[PDB]
Amino acid sequence: MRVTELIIDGFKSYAVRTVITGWDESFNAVTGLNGSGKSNILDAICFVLGITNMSTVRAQNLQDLIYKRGQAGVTKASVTIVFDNRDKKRSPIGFEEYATISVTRQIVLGGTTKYLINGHRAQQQTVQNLFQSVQLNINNPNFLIMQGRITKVLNMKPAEILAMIEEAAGTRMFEDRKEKALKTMAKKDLKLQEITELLRDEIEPKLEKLRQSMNMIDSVEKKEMSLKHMMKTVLKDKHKIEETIATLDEYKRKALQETWEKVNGDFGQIFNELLPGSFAKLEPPEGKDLTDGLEVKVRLGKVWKQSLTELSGGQRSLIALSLIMALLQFKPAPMYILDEVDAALDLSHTQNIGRLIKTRFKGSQFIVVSLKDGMFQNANRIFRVRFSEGTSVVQALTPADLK
Secondary structure (H helix, E strand, O other), X not given: OEEEEEEEEOEOOEOOOEEEEXXXXXXXXXEEOOHHHHHHHHHHHHHHHOOOXXXXXXXXXXXXXXXXXXXXXXXXXXXXXXXEOOOHHHOOOOOOOOOEEEEEEEEOOOOOEEEEEOOEEEOHHHHHHHHHHOOOOOOOOOOEEEHHXXXXXXXXOHHHHHHHHHHHHOOOOOHHHHHHHXXXXXXXXXXXXHHHHHHHHHHHHHXXXXXXXXXXHHHHHHHHHHHHHHHHHHHHHHHHHHHHHHHHHHHHHHHXXXXXXXXXXXXXXXHHHHOOOOEXXXXXXXXXXXXXXXXXXXXXXXXXXXXXXXXXHHHHHHHHXXXXXXXXXXXXXXXXXXXXXXXXXOHHHHHHHHHHHHHHOOOOEEEEEOOOOOOOOOOOEEEEEEEEOOEEEEEEEOOOOOO
């Protein structure tokens, strides 16, 4: 799936039906000086996707999202996303028969909302299942990168960064075999405790009494031989489980080691493309192990720096962005949104982001919402927004356009 069309009707600053068509399969930028008109395009997208962790499309009464809150001749709102669905390997399950898929979300007076799929009424859960089947995880969005995530990554502790790498390793789905092994061992341990309980409370006291008639001694003495032979065989069965667990802990540590090397390699190459001549790596802090966590180390130019605090604002954004993007491959999504990440960035830096997208993220659709104007001017498709007449208007352009 990839966005081909977005229609915004009676929603926030978009008073009149606005058909925004021509979305590029790889790289779109939303630009211009109309801050509200730009941001409302992202709002409209997140509103249809059902994003619940974005304050700008959240309200006690969603009538607030209708243009002028329903008081200026528009009493309903509608947003539609149209997706191309020709690539059947990336189709939502259960919708493969559609060459295109449209999802519409409506607001009426009072704030109740409804959904349509391909123009027909649809349950909210049907819409959410569709998006989740193509890895647009509305529950915990992987595909939306805001300034807050950049700041959060910049402030993570070594333990928190290693958590990301552990999380990316994909070995908690490995863990299922480990905890099945653990309780087949706990059952083995249980038998050992009841073997020693029998000896302690029953066999050994009786043998000591019988030894201080003569046929009863050897009857109990054989039972002490029985459970001893049993205790031995249980210990060795339990040991085979201990080896099984030892091998899964080994697979765990190798998978993480491999993930660390993959992320660290991509992270440093990405940062070198966003800040040419520079480099970065993920390393344990100093004289510490890998499971005490990983910290970001930066080489500005050819010189390694002791702390991230020594980087400019723009360099800091680029290093966090490079790590975020190096990790996308482990929770991949068919579209990615970079929302207003350019506050501290030069124009050359944002041009570098565009070439990174075009060369390294083929097969995904990027949508970049520019904070400043004049950035991301090499995007394959440019949507330029400005203010007029109590309604936003959108120009659809390319870098090759004369106007």
